[PDB]
From Swiss-Prot:
This is SH3 domain-containing kinase-binding protein 1. Residues 8-62 form the SH3 domain. The chain holds residues 101 to 155 of 709 of the full protein. Monoubiquitinated by CBL and CBLB after EGF stimulation; probably on its C-terminus. Disulfide bonds: none annotated. It is found in: Cytoplasm; Cytoplasm, Cytoskeleton; Cytoplasmic vesicle membrane; Synapse, Synaptosome. Can self-associate and form homotetramers. Interacts with CD2, F-actin capping protein, PIK3R3, GRB2, EGFR, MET, BLNK, MAP3K4, PDCD6IP, SPRY2, ARHGAP17, ARHGAP27, CRK, BCAR1, SOS1, ASAP1, ARAP3, HIP1R, SYNJ2, INPP5D and STAP1. Interacts with E3 ubiquitin-protein ligase CBL. Interacts with CBLB, but does not interact with CBLC. Two molecules of SH3KBP1 seem to bind through their respective SH3 1 domain to one molecule of CBLB. The interaction with CBL or CBLB and EGFR is increased upon EGF stimulation. The interaction with CBL is attenuated by PDCD6IP. Interacts (via SH3 domains) with ARAP1. Adapter protein involved in regulating diverse signal transduction pathways. Involved in the regulation of endocytosis and lysosomal degradation of ligand-induced receptor tyrosine kinases, including EGFR and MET/hepatocyte growth factor receptor, through an association with CBL and endophilins. The association with CBL, and thus the receptor internalization, may be inhibited by an interaction with PDCD6IP and/or SPRY2. Involved in regulation of ligand-dependent endocytosis of the IgE receptor. Attenuates phosphatidylinositol 3-kinase activity by interaction with its regulatory subunit.
Length: 68
């Protein structure tokens, strides 16, 4: 019994403007592919190819057959 878990998706519930040139720009409706985790309350993902540290306290994970 072995599996390979890698690649997560989450929808941005709150838009976030990057005050730096190393942050991600969250936009209500945006989906960041959680690649890893920066720090407590901060996760790491991709925003349409982009990448940067963002707060995981302003999104909403998505699992199972959860569609709009």
């Amino acid at each position: 019994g072995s599996s390979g878990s890698s690649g997560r998706r989450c929808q941005v519930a709150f838009s976030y403007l990057p005050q730096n040139d190393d942050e991600l720009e969250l936009k209500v409706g945006d989906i960041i592919e959680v690649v890893g985790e920066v720090e407590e309350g901060w996760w790491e993902g991709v925003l349409n190819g982009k990448t940067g540290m963002f707060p995981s306290n302003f999104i909403k994970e998505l699992s199972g057959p959860s569609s709009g």
